[PDB]
mmCIF file of C-alpha atoms and ligand atoms in Angstrom:
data_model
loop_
_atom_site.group_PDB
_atom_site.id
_atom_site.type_symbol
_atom_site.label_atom_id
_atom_site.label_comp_id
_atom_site.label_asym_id
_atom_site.label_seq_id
_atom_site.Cartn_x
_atom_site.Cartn_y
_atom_site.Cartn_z
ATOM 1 C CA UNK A 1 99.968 106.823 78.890
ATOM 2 C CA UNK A 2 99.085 105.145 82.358
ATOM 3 C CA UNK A 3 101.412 104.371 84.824
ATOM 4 C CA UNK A 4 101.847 101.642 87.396
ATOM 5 C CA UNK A 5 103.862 101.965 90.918
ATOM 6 C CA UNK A 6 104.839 98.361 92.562
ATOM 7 C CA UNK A 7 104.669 98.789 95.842
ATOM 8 C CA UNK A 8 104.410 95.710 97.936
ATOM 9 C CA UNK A 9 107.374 93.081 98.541
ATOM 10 C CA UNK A 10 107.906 92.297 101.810
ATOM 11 C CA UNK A 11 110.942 94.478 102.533
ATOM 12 C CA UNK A 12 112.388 91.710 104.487
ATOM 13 C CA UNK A 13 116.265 93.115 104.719
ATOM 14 C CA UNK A 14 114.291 96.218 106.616
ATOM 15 C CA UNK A 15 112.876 94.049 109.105
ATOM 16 C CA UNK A 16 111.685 95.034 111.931
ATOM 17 C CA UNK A 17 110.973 98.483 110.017
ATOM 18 C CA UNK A 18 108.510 96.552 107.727
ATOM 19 C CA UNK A 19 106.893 94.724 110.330
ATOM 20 C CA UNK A 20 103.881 96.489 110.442
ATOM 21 C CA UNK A 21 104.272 99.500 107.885
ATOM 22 C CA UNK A 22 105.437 98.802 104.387
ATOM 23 C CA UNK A 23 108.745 99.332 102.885
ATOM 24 C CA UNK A 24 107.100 101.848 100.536
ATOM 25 C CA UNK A 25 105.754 104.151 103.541
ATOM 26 C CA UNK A 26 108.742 104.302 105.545
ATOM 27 C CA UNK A 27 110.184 108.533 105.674
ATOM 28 C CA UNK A 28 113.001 109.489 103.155
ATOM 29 C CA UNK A 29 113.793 112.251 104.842
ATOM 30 C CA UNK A 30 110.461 113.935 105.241
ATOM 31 C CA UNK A 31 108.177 112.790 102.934
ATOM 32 C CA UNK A 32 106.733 109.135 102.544
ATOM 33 C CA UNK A 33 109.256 106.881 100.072
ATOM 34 C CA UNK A 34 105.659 106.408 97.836
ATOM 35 C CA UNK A 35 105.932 110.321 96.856
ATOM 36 C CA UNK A 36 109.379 109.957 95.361
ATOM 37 C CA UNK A 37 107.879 107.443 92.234
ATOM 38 C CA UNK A 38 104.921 109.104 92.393
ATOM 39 C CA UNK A 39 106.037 112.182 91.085
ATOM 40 C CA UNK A 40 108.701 110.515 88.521
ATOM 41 C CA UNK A 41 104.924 109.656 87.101
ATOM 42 C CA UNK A 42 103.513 112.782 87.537
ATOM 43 C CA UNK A 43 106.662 114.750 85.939
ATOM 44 C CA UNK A 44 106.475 111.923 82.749
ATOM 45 C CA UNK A 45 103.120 113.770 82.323
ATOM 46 C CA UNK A 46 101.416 110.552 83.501
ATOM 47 C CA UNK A 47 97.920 111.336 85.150
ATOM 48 C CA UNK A 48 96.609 107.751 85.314
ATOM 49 C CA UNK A 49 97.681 105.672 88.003
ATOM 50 C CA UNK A 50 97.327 102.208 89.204
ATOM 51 C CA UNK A 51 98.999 101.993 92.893
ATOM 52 C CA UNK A 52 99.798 98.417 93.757
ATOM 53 C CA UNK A 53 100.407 96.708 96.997
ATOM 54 C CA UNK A 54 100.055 93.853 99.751
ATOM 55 C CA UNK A 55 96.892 92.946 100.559
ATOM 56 C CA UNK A 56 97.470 94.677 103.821
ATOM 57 C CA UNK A 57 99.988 97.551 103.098
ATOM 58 C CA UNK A 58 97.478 98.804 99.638
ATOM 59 C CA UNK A 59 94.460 100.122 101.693
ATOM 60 C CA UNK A 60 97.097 102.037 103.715
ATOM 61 C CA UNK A 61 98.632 103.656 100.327
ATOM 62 C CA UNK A 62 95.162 104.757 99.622
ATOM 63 C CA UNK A 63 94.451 106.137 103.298
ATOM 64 C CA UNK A 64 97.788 108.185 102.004
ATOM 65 C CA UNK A 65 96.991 109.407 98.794
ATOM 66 C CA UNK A 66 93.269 108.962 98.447
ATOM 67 C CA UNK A 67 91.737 108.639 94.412
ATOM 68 C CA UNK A 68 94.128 111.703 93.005
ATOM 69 C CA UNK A 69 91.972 114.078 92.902
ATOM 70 C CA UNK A 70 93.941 116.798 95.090
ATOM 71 C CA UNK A 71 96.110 116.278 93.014
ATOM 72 C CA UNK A 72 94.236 116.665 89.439
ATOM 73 C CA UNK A 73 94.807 113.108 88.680
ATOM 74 C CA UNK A 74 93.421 109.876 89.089
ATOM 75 C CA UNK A 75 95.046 107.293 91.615
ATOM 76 C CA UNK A 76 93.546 103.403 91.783
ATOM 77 C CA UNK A 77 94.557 100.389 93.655
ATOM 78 C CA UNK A 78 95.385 96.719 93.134
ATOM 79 C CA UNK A 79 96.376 94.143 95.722
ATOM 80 C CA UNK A 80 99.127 91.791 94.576
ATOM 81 C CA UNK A 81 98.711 88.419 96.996
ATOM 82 C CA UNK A 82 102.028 87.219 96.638
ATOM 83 C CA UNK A 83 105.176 89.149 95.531
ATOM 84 C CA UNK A 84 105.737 86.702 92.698
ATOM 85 C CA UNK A 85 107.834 89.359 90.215
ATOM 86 C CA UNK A 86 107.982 92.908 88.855
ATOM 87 C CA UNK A 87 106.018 91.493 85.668
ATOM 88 C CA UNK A 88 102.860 90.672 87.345
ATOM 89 C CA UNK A 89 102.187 94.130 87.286
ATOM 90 C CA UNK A 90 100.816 93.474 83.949
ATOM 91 C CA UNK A 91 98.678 91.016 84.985
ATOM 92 C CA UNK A 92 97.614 92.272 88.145
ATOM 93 C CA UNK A 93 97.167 95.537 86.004
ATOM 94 C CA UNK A 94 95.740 94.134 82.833
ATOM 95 C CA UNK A 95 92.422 95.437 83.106
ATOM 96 C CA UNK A 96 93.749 98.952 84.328
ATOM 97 C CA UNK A 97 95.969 99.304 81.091
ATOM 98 C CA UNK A 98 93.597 98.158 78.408
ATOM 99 C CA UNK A 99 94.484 99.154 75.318
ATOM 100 C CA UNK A 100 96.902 101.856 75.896
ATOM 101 C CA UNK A 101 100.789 102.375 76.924
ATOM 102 C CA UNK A 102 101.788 102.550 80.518
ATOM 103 C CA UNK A 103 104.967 103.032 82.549
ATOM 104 C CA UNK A 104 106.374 100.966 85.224
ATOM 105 C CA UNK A 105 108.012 102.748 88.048
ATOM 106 C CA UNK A 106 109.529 100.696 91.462
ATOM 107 C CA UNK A 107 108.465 101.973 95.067
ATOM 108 C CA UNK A 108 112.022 101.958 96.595
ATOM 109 C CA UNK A 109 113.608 104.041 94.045
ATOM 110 C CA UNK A 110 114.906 107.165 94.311
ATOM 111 C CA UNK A 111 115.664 109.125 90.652
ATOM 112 C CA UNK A 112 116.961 112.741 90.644
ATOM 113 C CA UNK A 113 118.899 114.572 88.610
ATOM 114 C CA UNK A 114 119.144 117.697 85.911
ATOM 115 C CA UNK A 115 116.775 117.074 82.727
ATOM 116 C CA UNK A 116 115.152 114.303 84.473
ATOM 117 C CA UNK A 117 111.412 115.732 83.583
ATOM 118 C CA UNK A 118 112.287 116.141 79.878
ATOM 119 C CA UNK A 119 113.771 112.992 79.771
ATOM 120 C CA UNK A 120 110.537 111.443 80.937
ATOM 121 C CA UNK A 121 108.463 113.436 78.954
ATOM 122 C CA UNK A 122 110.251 112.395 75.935
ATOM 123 C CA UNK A 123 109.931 108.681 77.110
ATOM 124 C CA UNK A 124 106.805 108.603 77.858
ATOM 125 C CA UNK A 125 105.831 109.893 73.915
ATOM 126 C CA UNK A 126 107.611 107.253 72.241
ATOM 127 C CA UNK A 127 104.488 104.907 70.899
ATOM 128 C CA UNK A 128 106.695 102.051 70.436
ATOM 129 C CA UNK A 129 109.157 99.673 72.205
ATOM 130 C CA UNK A 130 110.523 99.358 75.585
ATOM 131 C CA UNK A 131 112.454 102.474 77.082
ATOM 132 C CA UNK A 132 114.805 101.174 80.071
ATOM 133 C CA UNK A 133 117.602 103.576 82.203
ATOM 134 C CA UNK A 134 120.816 102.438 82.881
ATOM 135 C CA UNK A 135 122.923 104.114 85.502
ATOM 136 C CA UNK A 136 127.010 103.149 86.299
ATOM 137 C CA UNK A 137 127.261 101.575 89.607
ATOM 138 C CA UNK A 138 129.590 99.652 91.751
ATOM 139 C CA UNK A 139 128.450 96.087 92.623
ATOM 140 C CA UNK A 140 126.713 95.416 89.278
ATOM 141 C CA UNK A 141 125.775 91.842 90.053
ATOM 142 C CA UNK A 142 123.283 93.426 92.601
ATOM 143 C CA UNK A 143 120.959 94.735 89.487
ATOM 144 C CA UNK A 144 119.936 94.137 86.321
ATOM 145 C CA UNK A 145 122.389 94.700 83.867
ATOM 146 C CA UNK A 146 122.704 95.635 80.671
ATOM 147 C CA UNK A 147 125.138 95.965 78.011
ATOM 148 C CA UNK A 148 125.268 98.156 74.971
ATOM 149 C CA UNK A 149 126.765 99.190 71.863
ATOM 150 C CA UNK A 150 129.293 102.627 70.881
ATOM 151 C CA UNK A 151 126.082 103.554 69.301
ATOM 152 C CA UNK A 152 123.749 102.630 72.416
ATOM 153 C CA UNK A 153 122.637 100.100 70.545
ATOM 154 C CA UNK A 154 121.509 97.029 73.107
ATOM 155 C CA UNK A 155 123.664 94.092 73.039
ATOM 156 C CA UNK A 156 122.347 92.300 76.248
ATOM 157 C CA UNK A 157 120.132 92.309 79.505
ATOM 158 C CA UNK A 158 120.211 89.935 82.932
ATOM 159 C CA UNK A 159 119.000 89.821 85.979
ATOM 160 C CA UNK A 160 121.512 90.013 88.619
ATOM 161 C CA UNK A 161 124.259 88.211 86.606
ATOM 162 C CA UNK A 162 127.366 86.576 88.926
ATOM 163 C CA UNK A 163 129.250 87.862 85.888
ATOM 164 C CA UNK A 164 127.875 91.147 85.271
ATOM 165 C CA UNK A 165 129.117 91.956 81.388
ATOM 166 C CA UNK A 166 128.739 95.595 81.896
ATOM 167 C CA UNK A 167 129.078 98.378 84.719
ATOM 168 C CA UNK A 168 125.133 99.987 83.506
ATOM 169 C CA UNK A 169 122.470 98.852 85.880
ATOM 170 C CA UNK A 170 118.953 98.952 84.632
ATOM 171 C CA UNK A 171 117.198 100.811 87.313
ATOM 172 C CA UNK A 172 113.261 100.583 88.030
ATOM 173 C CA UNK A 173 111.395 102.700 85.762
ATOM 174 C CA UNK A 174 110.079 101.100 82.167
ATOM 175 C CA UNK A 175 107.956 103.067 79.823
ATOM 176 C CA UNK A 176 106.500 100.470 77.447
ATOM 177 C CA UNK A 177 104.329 100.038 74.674
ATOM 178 C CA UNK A 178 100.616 97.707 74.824
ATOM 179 C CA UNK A 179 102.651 94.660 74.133
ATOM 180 C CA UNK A 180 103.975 94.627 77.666
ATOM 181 C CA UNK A 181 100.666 92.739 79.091
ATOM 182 C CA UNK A 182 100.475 89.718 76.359
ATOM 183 C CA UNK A 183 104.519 89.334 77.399
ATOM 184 C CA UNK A 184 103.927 89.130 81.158
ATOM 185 C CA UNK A 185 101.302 86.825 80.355
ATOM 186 C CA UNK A 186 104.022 84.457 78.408
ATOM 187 C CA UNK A 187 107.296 84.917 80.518
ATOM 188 C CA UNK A 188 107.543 81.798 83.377
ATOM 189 C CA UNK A 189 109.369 82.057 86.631
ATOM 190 C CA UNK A 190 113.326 82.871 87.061
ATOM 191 C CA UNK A 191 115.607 80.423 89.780
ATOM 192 C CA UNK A 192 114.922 83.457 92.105
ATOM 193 C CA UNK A 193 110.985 82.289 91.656
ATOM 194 C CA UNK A 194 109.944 85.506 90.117
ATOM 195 C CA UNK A 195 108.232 86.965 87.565
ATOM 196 C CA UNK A 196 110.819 88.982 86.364
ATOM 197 C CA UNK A 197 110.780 92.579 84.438
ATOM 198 C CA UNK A 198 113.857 91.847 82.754
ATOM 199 C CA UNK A 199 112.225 89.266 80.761
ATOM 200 C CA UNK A 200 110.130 91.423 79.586
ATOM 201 C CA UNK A 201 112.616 93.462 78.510
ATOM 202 C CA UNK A 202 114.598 90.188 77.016
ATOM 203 C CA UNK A 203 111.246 90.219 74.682
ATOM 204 C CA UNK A 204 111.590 93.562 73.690
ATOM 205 C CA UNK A 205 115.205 92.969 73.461
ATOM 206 C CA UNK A 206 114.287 89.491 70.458
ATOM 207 C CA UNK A 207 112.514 92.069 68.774
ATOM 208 C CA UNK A 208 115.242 94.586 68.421
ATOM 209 C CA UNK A 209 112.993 96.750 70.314
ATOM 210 C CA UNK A 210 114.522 97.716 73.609
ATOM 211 C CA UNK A 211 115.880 101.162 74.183
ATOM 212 C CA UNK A 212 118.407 102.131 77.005
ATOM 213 C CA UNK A 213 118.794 105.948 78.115
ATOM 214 C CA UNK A 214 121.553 105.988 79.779
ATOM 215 C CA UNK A 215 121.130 108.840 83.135
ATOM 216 C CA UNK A 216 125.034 109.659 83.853
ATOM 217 C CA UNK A 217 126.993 109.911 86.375
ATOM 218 C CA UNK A 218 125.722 113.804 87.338
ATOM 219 C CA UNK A 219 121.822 112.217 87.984
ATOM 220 C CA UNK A 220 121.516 110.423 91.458
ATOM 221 C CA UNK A 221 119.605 107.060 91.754
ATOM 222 C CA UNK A 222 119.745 105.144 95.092
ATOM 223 C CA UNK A 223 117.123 102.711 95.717
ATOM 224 C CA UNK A 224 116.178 102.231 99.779
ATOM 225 C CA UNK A 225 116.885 98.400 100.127
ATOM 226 C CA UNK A 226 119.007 98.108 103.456
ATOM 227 C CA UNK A 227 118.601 100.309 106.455
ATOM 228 C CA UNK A 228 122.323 102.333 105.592
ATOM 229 C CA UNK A 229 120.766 102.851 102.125
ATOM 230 C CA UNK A 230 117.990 104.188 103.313
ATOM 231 C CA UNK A 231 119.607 106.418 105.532
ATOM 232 C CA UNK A 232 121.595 107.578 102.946
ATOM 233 C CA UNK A 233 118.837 108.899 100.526
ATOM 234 C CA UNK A 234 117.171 110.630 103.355
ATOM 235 C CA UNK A 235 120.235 112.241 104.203
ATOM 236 C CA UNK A 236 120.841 113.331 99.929
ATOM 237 C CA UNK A 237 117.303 114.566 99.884
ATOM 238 C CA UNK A 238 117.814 117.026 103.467
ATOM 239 C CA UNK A 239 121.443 118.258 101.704
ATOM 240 C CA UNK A 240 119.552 119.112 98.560
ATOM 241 C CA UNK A 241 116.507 120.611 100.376
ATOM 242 C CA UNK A 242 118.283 122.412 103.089
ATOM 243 C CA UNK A 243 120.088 124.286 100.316
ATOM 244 C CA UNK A 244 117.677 125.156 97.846
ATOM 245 C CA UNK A 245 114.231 126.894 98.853
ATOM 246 C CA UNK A 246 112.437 124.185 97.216
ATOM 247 C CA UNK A 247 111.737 120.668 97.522
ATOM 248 C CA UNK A 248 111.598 116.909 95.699
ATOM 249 C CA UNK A 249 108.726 115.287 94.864
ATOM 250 C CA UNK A 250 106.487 117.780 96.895
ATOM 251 C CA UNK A 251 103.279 115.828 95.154
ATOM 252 C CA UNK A 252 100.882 119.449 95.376
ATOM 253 C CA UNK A 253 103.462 121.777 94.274
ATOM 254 C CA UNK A 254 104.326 119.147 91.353
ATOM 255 C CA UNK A 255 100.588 118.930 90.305
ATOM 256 C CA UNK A 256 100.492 122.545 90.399
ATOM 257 C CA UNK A 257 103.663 123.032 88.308
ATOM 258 C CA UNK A 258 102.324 120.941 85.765
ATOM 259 C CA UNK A 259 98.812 122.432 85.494
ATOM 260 C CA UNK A 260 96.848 119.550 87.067
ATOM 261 C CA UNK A 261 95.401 121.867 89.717
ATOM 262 C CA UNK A 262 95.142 125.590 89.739
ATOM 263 C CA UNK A 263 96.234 128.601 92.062
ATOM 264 C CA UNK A 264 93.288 128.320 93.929
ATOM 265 C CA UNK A 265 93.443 124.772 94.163
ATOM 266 C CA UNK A 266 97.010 124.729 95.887
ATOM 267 C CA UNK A 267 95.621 127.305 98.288
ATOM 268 C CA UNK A 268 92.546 124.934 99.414
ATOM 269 C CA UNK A 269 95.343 122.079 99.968
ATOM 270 C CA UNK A 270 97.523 124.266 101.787
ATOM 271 C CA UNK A 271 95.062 125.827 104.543
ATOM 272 C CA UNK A 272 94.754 122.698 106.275
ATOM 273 C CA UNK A 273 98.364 122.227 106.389
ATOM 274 C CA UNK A 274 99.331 125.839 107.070
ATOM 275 C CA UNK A 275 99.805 124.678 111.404
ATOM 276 C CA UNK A 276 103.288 122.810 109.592
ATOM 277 C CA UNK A 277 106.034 123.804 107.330
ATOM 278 C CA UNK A 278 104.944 121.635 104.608
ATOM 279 C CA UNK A 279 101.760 123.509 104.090
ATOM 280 C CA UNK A 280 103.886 126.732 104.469
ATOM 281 C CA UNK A 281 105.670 125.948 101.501
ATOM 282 C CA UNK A 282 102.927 124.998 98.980
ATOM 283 C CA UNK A 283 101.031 128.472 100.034
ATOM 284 C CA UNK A 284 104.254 130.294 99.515
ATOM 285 C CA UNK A 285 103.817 128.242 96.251
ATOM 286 C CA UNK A 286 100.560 129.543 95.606
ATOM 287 C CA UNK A 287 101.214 133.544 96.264
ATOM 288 C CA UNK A 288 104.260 133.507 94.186
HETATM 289 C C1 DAU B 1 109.257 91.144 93.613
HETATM 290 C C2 DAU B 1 108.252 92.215 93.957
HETATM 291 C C3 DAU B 1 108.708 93.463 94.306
HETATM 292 N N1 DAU B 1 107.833 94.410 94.647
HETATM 293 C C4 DAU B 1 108.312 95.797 94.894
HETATM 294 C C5 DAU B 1 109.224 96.031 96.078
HETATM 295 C C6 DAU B 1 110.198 97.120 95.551
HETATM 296 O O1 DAU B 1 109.634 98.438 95.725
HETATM 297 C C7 DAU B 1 110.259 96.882 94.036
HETATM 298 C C8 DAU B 1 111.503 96.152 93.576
HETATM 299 O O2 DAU B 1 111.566 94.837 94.149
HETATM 300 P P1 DAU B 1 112.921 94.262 94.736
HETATM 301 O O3 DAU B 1 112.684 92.810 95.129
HETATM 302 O O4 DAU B 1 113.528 95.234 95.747
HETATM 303 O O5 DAU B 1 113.818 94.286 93.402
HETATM 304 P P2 DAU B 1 115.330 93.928 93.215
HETATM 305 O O6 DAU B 1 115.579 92.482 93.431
HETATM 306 O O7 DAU B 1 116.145 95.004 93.928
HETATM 307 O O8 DAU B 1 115.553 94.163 91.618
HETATM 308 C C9 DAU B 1 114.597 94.859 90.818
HETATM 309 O O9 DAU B 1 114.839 96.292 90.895
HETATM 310 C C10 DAU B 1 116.162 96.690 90.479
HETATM 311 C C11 DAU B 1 116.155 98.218 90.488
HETATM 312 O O10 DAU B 1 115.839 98.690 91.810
HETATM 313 C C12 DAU B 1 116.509 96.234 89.035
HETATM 314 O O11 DAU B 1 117.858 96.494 88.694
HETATM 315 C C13 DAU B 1 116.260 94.731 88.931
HETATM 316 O O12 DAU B 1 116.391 94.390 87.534
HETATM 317 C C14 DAU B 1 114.830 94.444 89.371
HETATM 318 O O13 DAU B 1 114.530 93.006 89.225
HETATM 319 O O14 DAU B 1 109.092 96.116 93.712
HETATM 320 C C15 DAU B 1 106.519 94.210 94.557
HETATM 321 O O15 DAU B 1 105.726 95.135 94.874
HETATM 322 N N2 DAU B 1 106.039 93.022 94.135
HETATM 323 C C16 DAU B 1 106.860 92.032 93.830
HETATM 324 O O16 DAU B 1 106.365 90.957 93.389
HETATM 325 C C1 DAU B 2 109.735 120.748 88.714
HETATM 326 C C2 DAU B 2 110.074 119.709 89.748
HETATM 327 C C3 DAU B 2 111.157 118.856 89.539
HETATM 328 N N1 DAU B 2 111.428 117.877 90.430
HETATM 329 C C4 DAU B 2 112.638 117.053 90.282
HETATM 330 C C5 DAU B 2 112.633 116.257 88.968
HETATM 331 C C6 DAU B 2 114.131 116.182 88.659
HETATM 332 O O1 DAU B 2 114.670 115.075 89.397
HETATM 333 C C7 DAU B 2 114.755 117.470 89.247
HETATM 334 C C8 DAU B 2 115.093 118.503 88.185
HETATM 335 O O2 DAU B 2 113.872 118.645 87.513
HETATM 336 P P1 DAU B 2 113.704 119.514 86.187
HETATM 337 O O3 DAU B 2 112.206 119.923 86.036
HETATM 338 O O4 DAU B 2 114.271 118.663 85.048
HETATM 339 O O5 DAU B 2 114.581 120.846 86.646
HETATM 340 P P2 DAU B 2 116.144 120.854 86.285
HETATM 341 O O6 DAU B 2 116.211 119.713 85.304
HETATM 342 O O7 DAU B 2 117.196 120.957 87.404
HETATM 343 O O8 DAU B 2 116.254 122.320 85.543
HETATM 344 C C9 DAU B 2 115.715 122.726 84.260
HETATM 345 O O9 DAU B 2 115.957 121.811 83.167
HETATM 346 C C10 DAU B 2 115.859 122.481 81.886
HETATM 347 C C11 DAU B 2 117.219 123.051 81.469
HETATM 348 O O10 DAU B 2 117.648 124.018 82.439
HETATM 349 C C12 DAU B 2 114.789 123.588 81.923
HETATM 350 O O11 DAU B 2 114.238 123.783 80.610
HETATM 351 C C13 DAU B 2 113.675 123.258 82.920
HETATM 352 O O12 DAU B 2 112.666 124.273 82.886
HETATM 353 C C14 DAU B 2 114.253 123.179 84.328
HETATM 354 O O13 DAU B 2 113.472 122.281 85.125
HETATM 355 O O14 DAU B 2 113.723 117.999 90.128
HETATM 356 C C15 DAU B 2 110.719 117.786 91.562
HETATM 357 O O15 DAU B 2 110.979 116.884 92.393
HETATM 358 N N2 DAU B 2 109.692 118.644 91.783
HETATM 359 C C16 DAU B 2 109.347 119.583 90.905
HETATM 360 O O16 DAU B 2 108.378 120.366 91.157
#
């Protein structure tokens, strides 16, 4: 499967932040926001990866991660113009995706939880359909929403409804089957003037094909719209990191983990780091 990451938008509730550095590279905590979808793809088993962004924020992504291969897999780049909807990923991405499956993952969100990386996994080995992940929230209307079934089943999905007719957000990660890129190429613009994923997922959804995972109320999703949103994912990620010896979506240590890279490998990337605490903690990586 491929994957995409959508990172461009103009990020203008973070303004003056996003003046002159994009939404997508502003810190959570202590790593770039970029990493934290990045390695939701690289956990999904995902090593083929289209990166795309403004025409001025995407050479900056690729200053950041370079082509992939520190990391044993293989990172490309596509400007988007205009930020004219999630679903001209697609488009934008059409050539990229060819033939095969790919996965849809948002910039500004942040997934974590217990199970997560077998949950991908699984998701991203179903050959058919639309897989979508709804999570509980508060102000519903802010989202996507959807609404199931006792048995899961979909009953509905809509973009940020002023009657929301369920609780269950559908946050921004979409594993989908080849079908995805004729559908972008037939869905027209919302009232909002956008492109939107969740008509995409309304065509999976005609076809009886759209499958919700629901995450629970134990995973954490935030997204890093607003500055006190933001604030508050960096601040979950340094509780969970200050705690534990280990941290999330440390891109080296995940691509080590996972087999991309080798022993050796994680050594060469960690020598030049070694002068920070970063690089301390992928060579402790490597020795253990
Ligand atoms: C519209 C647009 C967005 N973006 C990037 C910026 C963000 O990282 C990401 C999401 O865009 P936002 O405009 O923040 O999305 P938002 O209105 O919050 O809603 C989207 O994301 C929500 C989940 O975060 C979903 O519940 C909604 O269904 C979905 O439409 O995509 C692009 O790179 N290009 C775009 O054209
Ligand atoms: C391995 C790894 C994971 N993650 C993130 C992805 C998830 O949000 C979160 C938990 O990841 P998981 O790999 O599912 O680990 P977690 O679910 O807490 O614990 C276990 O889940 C299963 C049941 O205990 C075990 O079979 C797995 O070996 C073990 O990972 O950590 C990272 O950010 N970096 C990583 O290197």
């Amino acid at each position: 499967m491929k994957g995409i990451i959508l990172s461009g938008g103009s990020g203008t509730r973070l303004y003056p932040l996003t003046k002159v550095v994009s939404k997508q590279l502003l810190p959570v905590y202590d790593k770039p926001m970029v990493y934290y979808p990045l390695s939701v793809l690289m956990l999904a088993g995902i090593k083929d990866i289209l990166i795309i962004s403004t025409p001025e924020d995407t050479p900056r992504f690729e200053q950041l991660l370079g082509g992939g291969s520190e990391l044993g897999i293989s990172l490309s780049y596509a400007v988007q113009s205009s930020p004219d909807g999630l679903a001209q990923a697609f488009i934008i991405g059409e050539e990229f995706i060819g033939d095969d499956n790919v996965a849809l993952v948002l910039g500004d969100n942040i997934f974590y939880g217990h199970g997560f990386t077998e949950l991908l996994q699984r998701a991203a080995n179903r050959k058919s359909g639309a897989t979508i992940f709804g999570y509980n929230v508060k102000d519903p209307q802010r989202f996507g929403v959807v609404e199931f079934d006792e048995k899961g089943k979909v009953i509905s999905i809509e973009e940020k409804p002023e009657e929301p007719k369920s609780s269950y957000a559908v946050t921004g990660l979409y594993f989908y089957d080849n079908r995805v890129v004729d559908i972008a190429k037939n869905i027209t613009p919302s009232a909002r003037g956008e492109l939107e994923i969740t008509d995409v997922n309304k065509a999976y959804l005609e076809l009886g094909e759209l499958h919700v995972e629901l995450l629970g109320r134990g995973f954490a999703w935030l997204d890093t719209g607003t500055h006190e949103s933001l604030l508050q994912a960096s601040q979950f990620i340094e509780t969970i990191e200050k705690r534990q010896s280990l941290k999330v979506a440390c891109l080296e240590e995940i691509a080590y983990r996972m087999g991309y890279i080798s022993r050796e490998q994680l050594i060469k990337l960690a020598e030049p780091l070694m002068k920070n605490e970063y690089g301390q903690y992928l060579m402790n990586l490597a020795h253990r």
